[PDB]
Amino acid sequence: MVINVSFKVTGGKEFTVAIEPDITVLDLKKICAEHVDIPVEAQRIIFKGKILKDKESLTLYGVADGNTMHLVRS
């Protein structure tokens, strides 16, 4: 089962993906890199006032269907 997560990306860009809620932050960055021109190592995913940590499952942060995150460059 998948949930939708939307991204607001620097430069007025937006996309939504359907993801398994227990993938890691790094998994999510790999998805983001297939949707926008920011390589994984330059991405910072901002959610709930934090820079999310690569090795952690998104469930640790309580990600929910319909949430929006921000994607910025290092």
Side-chain angles (χ1 to χ4, degrees), residues 3 6 10 12 14 21 41 47 52 62:
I3 64 164
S6 295
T10 308
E14 298 181 357
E41 298 86 358
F47 179 64
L52 302 189

Side-chain angles (χ1 to χ4, degrees), residues 3 5 19 21-22 47-48 58-65 67 69:
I3 64 164
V5 177
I19 61 170
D22 54 351
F47 179 64
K48 292 183 172 179
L58 297 180
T59 53
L60 290 171
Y61 297 110
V63 66
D65 194 5
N67 282 168
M69 305 190 180

